[PDB]
Structure 1
Amino acid sequence: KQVSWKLVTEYAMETKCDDVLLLLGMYLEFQYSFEMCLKCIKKEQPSHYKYHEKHYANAAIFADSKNQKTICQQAVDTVLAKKRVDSLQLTREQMLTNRFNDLLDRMDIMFGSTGSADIEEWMAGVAWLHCLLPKMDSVVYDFLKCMVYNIPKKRYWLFKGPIDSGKTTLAAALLELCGGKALNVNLPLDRLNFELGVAIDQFLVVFEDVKGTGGESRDLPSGQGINNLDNLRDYLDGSVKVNLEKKHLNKRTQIFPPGIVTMNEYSVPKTLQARFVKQIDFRPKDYLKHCLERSEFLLEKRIIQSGIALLLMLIWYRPVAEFAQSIQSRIVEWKERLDKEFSLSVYQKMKFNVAMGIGVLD
């Protein structure tokens, strides 16, 4: 007779949907018969086939409702409220553990019968990424600890090196593995605020491609990013809280999230250099390039820049004791799933091919 707003809210929650139009579009697909639904039989989208049958009755009524968007907004607000709560109550590690569980759910599907991803091509991604930097898995592990501990004046890493050396690649994968936002600090000192406002409630922040002015005789463009960065000392330090706002849509005082800054070997003042407790230098590697040429899927399926590849790397290299206790049982299941499909020699072989500059799957 009348639509259950609660049920729409429950769907948005289980789906973690915070987009009102997307929620509206998805729920409306449930108004059709679940009996011969091709979308459900073909198991195309989990966000659809796992919920159609259950929501069919409510959706049928929803389809006739005259307050559809209003119902969806309240659902989306409930999702936003839960993020609000988590942001204020969960420890930093729990936030991370939650993200890991969300990625593993995504992994269960892509590497499952729902069919889509070839777990072999992803481990090849792990091999390639493990040749981009020395002791790459330790680098990731240490980065995660630095992000969780969130120590004043010891929360930012600097990714520095020539173009095409892997800075954006690794930073993008870390951003997806942890959650967070990329920010452009090169903007003028009169809009750099609406930008910093995106950090609100964010676990981490990446200051992508910060352009300087020192040594611009090396084909290096001109930007204010560096100066506009050496003036955000209180933001980077994370000692005192800062006031952040994104338009009238949201405002909040808090310690600015920790993160990374990436730049193409410019000139870094000591006043800004002091803000970074670690600087990783990336270097172009002939073999990494040649490998990719013969391992096109890595780029075509955008595997090396994905957070799932980094999580897979942690599952393979890191001891179970290093993960949060609550998620350990699950990490064990994947370590076994990975050991079930890849012999050490088989994975080592992939690393070999990468170093040799040939196809990872050769």
Structure 2
Amino acid sequence: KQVSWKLVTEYAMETKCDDVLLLLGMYLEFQYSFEMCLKCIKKEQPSHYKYHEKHYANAAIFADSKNQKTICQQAVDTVLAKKRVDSLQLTREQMLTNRFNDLLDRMDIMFGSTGSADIEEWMAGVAWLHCLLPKMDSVVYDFLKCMVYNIPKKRYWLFKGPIDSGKTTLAAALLELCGGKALNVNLPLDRLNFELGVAIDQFLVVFEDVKGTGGESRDLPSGQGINNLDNLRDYLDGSVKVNLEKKHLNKRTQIFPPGIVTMNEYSVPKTLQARFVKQIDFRPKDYLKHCLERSEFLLEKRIIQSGIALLLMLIWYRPVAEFAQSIQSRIVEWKERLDKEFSLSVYQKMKFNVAMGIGVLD
């Protein structure tokens, strides 16, 4: 009897496998009998115990196949084709909604019955983040809106502030919440032609640790980053398409992704300042300094600086009507799971402890 290549493609699509060897290995595990399958009995991984019954008959015949890598290549090209169609055709709200749905899938297993995530440390992460900046959750919601709207000139945000003030901390978290990448624009004028190519097909970008020409009289190191950005005018504005180039690849023309500029207390050109819609002064405060050394429970299990923590902050603080109509259904379920586990008095006391510069107690 014949292998169904369509069934293999269904498994690849349902699990979003873009790797031919991962697909081959996982599918070969289904060749063993379901009735006695230890992995289905003890339910380690969802990509197995959901699918083994449906695919067992096909996987037996697949294990006898002489074509196995060809079958998987076609299935992986089907998944790559769906990604490519979605990239060109989705509206930018739907792209972010797909990212949030994927993060909620990670939530549902990360905080699963097998969940190594306790709600408690993740909610302490949320309270740390919500204490970092005045009216923080509006700042995150405003960031997502301007990044989704992608409106010309009114795109890039300037994070200006002292060292050890948390600016890389939040920028690195927003890359995980949205998808995106960071660029090192400090280079001489020639090499940044290739560095800018890192933005190709990204949803979002950040310019990290931009050095300026001035500030040596304040013991800031001089560097050409800011003077470069004043020349990258059209990439910021996003009014016209720019041609972007990569290591031994030919140029792509697209609108440059929106982003964030993270900068110390450097002086800026008036032209560059006029091209940032929002300036946020990050400034350090000592009770957060003291809280951190008191609170390694934020830094273990990667909870700080992770975008899944910022999503949890949005679920806790925003009204449900602000999320997309398709994800509103899943977000109310995560609302009530937070409501049950973290009563408002427990959260308030935890945030009060953060205001007192101390970790979780009681």
Would the alpha carbon gap of residues 337 and 226 (structure 1) be closer, same or farther in structure 2, given more than 3 Å must change?
same
Stretch of structure 1 that moved more, 241-250 or 10-19 = 241-250
Would the alpha carbon gap of residues 188 and 332 (structure 1) be closer, same or farther in structure 2, given more than 3 Å must change?
same
**TM-score where L is the length of structure 2:** 0.89
Would the alpha carbon gap of residues 194 and 6 (structure 1) be closer, same or farther in structure 2, given more than 3 Å must change?
farther
Stretch of structure 1 that moved more, 193-202 or 105-114 = 193-202
Q: Tell me, what secondary structure is at the counterpart of 1:235?
A: helix
Query: C-alpha separation between the residues in 2 aligned to 1:72 and 1:249?
Result: 27
Stretch of structure 1 that moved more, 180-189 or 20-29 = 20-29
Q: Tell me, what secondary structure is at the counterpart of 2:96?
A: helix
Alpha-carbon distance, 1:44 to partner: 3.2
Would the alpha carbon gap of residues 246 and 353 (structure 1) be closer, same or farther in structure 2, given more than 3 Å must change?
same
Alpha-carbon distance, 1:354 to partner: 0.7
Stretch of structure 1 that moved more, 339-348 or 268-277 = 268-277
Structure 2: runs of 5 or more not aligned: none
Would the alpha carbon gap of residues 199 and 361 (structure 1) be closer, same or farther in structure 2, given more than 3 Å must change?
farther
Would the alpha carbon gap of residues 68 and 277 (structure 1) be closer, same or farther in structure 2, given more than 3 Å must change?
farther
Contact 2:172 2:305 in 1 (8 A): yes
Larger radius of gyration: 2
Q: Tell me, what secondary structure is at the counterpart of 1:153?
A: coil
Alpha-carbon distance, 1:131 to partner: 0.5
Q: Tell me, what secondary structure is at the counterpart of 2:262?
A: strand
Identity %: 100
Contact 2:205 2:257 in 1 (8 A): yes
Query: C-alpha separation between the residues in 2 aligned to 1:356 and 1:268?
Result: 36
Q: Tell me, what secondary structure is at the counterpart of 1:177?
A: helix
**TM-score where L is the length of structure 1:** 0.89
Alpha-carbon distance, 1:58 to partner: 4.0
Contact 1:184 1:210 in 2 (8 A): yes
Would the alpha carbon gap of residues 230 and 79 (structure 1) be closer, same or farther in structure 2, given more than 3 Å must change?
farther
Contact 2:215 2:222 in 1 (8 A): no
Correspondence for 2:183: 183
Alpha-carbon distance, 1:175 to partner: 1.1
Stretch of structure 1 that moved more, 85-94 or 133-142 = 85-94
Would the alpha carbon gap of residues 239 and 67 (structure 1) be closer, same or farther in structure 2, given more than 3 Å must change?
farther
Residues 154-197 of structure 1: CA distance to partner in whole angstroms, max 9, x if unpaired?
11111221222111111111111111122222244334334333
Query: C-alpha separation between the residues in 2 aligned to 1:280 and 1:204?
Result: 18
Q: Tell me, what secondary structure is at the counterpart of 1:250?
A: strand
Equivalenced residue count is 362
Contact 1:109 1:115 in 2 (8 A): yes
Would the alpha carbon gap of residues 11 and 136 (structure 1) be closer, same or farther in structure 2, given more than 3 Å must change?
same
Residues 11-47 of structure 1: CA distance to partner in whole angstroms, max 9, x if unpaired?
3332333344444454444445544444444433333
Query: C-alpha separation between the residues in 2 aligned to 1:50 and 1:339?
Result: 29
Would the alpha carbon gap of residues 281 and 60 (structure 1) be closer, same or farther in structure 2, given more than 3 Å must change?
farther
Query: C-alpha separation between the residues in 1 aligned to 2:190 and 2:21?
Result: 32
Alpha-carbon distance, 1:244 to partner: 2.6
Residues 42-73 of structure 1: CA distance to partner in whole angstroms, max 9, x if unpaired?
43333344334434444455455555555444
Would the alpha carbon gap of residues 67 and 244 (structure 1) be closer, same or farther in structure 2, given more than 3 Å must change?
farther
Alpha-carbon distance, 1:85 to partner: 2.0
Contact 1:32 1:56 in 2 (8 A): yes
Alpha-carbon distance, 1:262 to partner: 1.4
Query: C-alpha separation between the residues in 2 aligned to 1:288 and 1:337?
Result: 28
Would the alpha carbon gap of residues 25 and 162 (structure 1) be closer, same or farther in structure 2, given more than 3 Å must change?
farther
Would the alpha carbon gap of residues 219 and 360 (structure 1) be closer, same or farther in structure 2, given more than 3 Å must change?
farther
Contact 1:291 1:360 in 2 (8 A): no
Q: Tell me, what secondary structure is at the counterpart of 2:218?
A: coil
Stretch of structure 1 that moved more, 39-48 or 93-102 = 39-48
Where do 1:82-97 residues align within 5 Å? 82-97=82-97
Stretch of structure 1 that moved more, 285-294 or 34-43 = 34-43
Contact 2:211 2:221 in 1 (8 A): yes
Alpha-carbon distance, 1:339 to partner: 1.3
Contact 1:203 1:257 in 2 (8 A): yes
- RMSD in angstroms over aligned alpha carbons? 2.6
Contact 1:84 1:201 in 2 (8 A): no
Correspondence for 1:310: 310
Would the alpha carbon gap of residues 270 and 113 (structure 1) be closer, same or farther in structure 2, given more than 3 Å must change?
same
Query: C-alpha separation between the residues in 1 aligned to 2:114 and 2:58?
Result: 26
- 1:74 lines up with 2:74 in the alignment: yes
Contact 1:176 1:307 in 2 (8 A): yes
Q: Tell me, what secondary structure is at the counterpart of 1:227?
A: helix
Stretch of structure 1 that moved more, 126-135 or 110-119 = 110-119
Would the alpha carbon gap of residues 345 and 88 (structure 1) be closer, same or farther in structure 2, given more than 3 Å must change?
same
Would the alpha carbon gap of residues 232 and 303 (structure 1) be closer, same or farther in structure 2, given more than 3 Å must change?
same
Stretch of structure 1 that moved more, 321-330 or 33-42 = 33-42
Contact 2:34 2:52 in 1 (8 A): yes
Residues 190-226 of structure 1: CA distance to partner in whole angstroms, max 9, x if unpaired?
3433433332332211122223332245554454433
Would the alpha carbon gap of residues 60 and 124 (structure 1) be closer, same or farther in structure 2, given more than 3 Å must change?
same
Contact 1:154 1:276 in 2 (8 A): yes
Stretch of structure 1 that moved more, 139-148 or 185-194 = 185-194
Query: C-alpha separation between the residues in 2 aligned to 1:6 and 1:250?
Result: 35
Contact 1:175 1:204 in 2 (8 A): yes
Alpha-carbon distance, 1:272 to partner: 1.9
Would the alpha carbon gap of residues 44 and 293 (structure 1) be closer, same or farther in structure 2, given more than 3 Å must change?
farther
